Design a protein around this ligand. Sequence first.
Ligand SMILES: CN[C@@H]1[C@@H](O)[C@@H](O[C@@H]2[C@@H](O)[C@H](O[C@H]3OC(CN)=CC[C@H]3N)[C@@H](N)C[C@H]2N)OC[C@]1(C)O
Length: 268
Amino acid sequence: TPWSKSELVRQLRDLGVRSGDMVMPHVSLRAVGPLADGPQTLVDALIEAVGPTGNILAFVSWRDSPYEQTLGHDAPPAAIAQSWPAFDPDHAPAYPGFGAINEFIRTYPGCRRTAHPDASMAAIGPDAAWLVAPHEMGAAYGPRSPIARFLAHAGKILSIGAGPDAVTALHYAEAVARIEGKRRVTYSMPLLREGKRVWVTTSDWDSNGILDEYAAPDGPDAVERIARDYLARTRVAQGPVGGAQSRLIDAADIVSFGIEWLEARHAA
Ligand SMILES: CN[C@@H]1[C@@H](O)[C@@H](O[C@@H]2[C@@H](O)[C@H](O[C@H]3OC(CN)=CC[C@H]3N)[C@@H](N)C[C@H]2N)OC[C@]1(C)O
């Protein structure tokens, strides 16, 4: 019997979501199980749960981000530069690998979209415009990003059947951690500025592992390491949303822990 919107709202209330909250969801729809009207049922429940003064923030990225195609070059390679689609925030599909629910979030009426094509964030609520802009190339997840503003606004991270690697806000801890050997990446994104397509090349922190030892593709990254150590140590509201085991995490607290975690393990 598929979960109804009102059943999900009650479960979110049980978990500790309150009207007015600013929530960042990370969702496994397979863990959630069948929904009355598909993924939209959970989007609707999240919006009801946070109320008209609350907010939803999601890391949605872009299905067609030219990340690997431009990585490590000081300019987009010519064949990429000449034909890649410009990122059009109100028309760009979410990256499917960060959750199929994100395409439902970002197409929700009134949803806003940040201008960083690879780190793109989607936001719903009165603070959505303040959350999504600015989002400059060179500020993907650290200071001046939407995640930084989320962290300054008592954000809660809502993990709904998702693994400990799916805690994007921890990339803020990596950005500001005073440790040696931090990995950086250089890539190019095609933006729209006044309807004109403009290639921007930038460097930023490597979001696939802030240090070498965390960036092997067949091992856990720093986000997962930090998140597992935090969840092993911290009382966190836990309970079902649909069929999925869920956690409601204080975003400022886990990011503070992560900064401490990184700085304790690596010299300045
Ligand atoms: C759309 N462009 C993408 C580009 O943004 C970047 O995505 C990052 C992404 O992997 C990270 O998620 C995975 O991280 C790891 C360890 N590597 C294991 C499983 C995931 N939790 C996320 N935390 C931060 C993202 N920025 O690289 C891939 C890409 C497809 O090119």
